[PDB]
Amino acid sequence: MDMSSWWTHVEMGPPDPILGVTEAFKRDTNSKKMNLGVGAYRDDNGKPYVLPSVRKAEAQIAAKNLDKEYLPIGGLAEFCKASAELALGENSEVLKSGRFVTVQTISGTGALRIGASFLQRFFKFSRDVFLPKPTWGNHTPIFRDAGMQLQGYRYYDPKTCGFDFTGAVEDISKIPEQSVLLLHACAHNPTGVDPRPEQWKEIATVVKKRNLFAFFDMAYQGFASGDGDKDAWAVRHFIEQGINVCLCQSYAKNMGLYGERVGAFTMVCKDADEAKRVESQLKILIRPMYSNPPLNGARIAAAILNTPDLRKQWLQEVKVMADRIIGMRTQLVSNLKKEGSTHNWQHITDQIGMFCFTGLKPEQVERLIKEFSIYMTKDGRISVAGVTSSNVGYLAHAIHQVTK
Amino acid sequence: SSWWTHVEMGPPDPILGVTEAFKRDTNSKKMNLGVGAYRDDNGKPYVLPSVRKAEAQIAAKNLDKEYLPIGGLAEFCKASAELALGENSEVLKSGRFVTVQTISGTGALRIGASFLQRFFKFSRDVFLPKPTWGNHTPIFRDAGMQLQGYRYYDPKTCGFDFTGAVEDISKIPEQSVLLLHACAHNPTGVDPRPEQWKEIATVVKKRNLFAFFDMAYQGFASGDGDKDAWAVRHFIEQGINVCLCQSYAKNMGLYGERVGAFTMVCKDADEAKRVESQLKILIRPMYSNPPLNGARIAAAILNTPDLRKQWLQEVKVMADRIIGMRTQLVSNLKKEGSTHNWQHITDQIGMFCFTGLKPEQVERLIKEFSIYMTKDGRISVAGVTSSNVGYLAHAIHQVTK
């Protein structure tokens, strides 16, 4: 008898490495264990953190007794406008001229995917999307599933645990004209290594000269440094130089709306007419993917952005979150010197965001797990969110022991 | 030059165009029979009381907003499978299924289509009913499949072309994909009767077709969730390992929360595990993980006995409102003196009705009475209320007499 089914030939997918680390962490019986693979912000008690401004926004919304009817294909208009304003800045000529289209998406991933699908259909010049080495794990399958091809450019420098400026500029200067270049706006995931403003300026010059299309992923505006204007400076600089970028925004981190799935995709265009045509085709792409986006998170974000008192309170809360992460970076470096480490750990404080490439080797990572129950990925990436005032001393001691 | 000089403006949306034209009309007696969502008897959006209670239950728990798994909220997925398959389903007992949370029904359709594209080595063809939901074609086309058609609606009876459907399905190449609306066919409202479903199942099984069910109206269609899901359950009983796209947009009124689920019925639990792994691999690069608000609500309703009972009552009232408007339209048409057969209006199921009105009659209804509907004669029964059903019947009588 032929006992075949439809899916006999469907193989079991490979294990997710990051998930494996957190799963291993959960099983560990050591009371001193640390999870430096956690992929979301945690407070100084190591707990999930709902922003008070978000709670207050929820109360504002709940009192209005709103319906749950479908949003437009491109989402909540109020949210889209406010999202664009956050990214581009109040003084933006792009906003004043209306030479842009912003559509609400299923968080940052949704924005990346919609952007990729738009490129597949309309960016006829090339299929190649250049990603930094390394980049977010999901970037490759997003573009690949969308029907694009992936290339790489040097970014992280293993020798310094910093930015390979020379290597990056060299690689970008050799990217075929009219190719897509993906850039992390700030808080590079997973290294935390960001170009300095003067380095950004040089990159922009090459992008403009070689007629590259700049695709910005901005998942950490405000969360990175505590200053939303500073964090979005590179994006705004490119636009000022006449580079009509696209932009993927997430509110997962900076508003802690992880599971609500709140994001936006923006295309900066030549003029309002071009934006209208791009908008129509974006909607044509969105509708057969999920028809229209979720309401709850967009209402919360819109309420925060468009209510002055809430916006101010939110920006305060974001700064405190950014400062906690900066503080843990600073305390780790300080404690490492206290422990008597002679290794250069300046990269830990030079990096930005909740992900840090430590430079730890796989063998050292393995020892940290076995001996100290400190869990991180084999690449030596740590989630700074997993570090608190209570365990930063323990972490520094452990890192010293495995590197001394 | 610019990057997007060659990007052209998209074509006008016919459905939206009807609503837009309706909005502009200055006639105080105007009716929008193109509305694509439930409305109460006052023509207003309707949030279910059970949903409000669920929200209150959830708000009190002070829950976080952390990422769900790729496949969504586990308790929602399990409850959703149970709703579709029935509590005593052998599929549940054997565990030979995978259910993942999706971005409502559209999300489920697209995930299903993407799964077919990647793993359904047996065919590229997806057979849609004539007619079907407008979004079906682009979902499968964008996903990388080919579309075909089978006869479904009979314009001569405004009913189900059983003979034509069975004929067409019997000639579908073996191991093709067949899309079926579980109940409340959109846009016609014409459904196979149980006995007709049985013969369709026999042909599907004989021709070794893959049955892809779209179920957006369980409970909403007839007020009886078990009746509405009967065809899906029958196919499974007959050894057809279907997939299923569920939406909670209509039956819980969770439209904009985007609450849905995709279920694959599998040979065994092992197969389900492999399919699950690949579903997650497809989901993650689309949107990473699904929204938590609506799933928590649906889960709370389904898993709280009191809320579930109240919800099912509310669903019945909504279904009965639509049935009531169909009945009253036909009755009023009779009283107006119409000699035409309007039995199809009460035979059809769901909030969409193919009236059989010709394009010329549709135009007159717009011009003379400001009653707005699509040129195919489809009306949204949700646009009909106690206050306007008399006006509608008079108008239809005038244009058809």
Ligand SMILES: [Cl-]
């Ligand atoms: Cl344990």
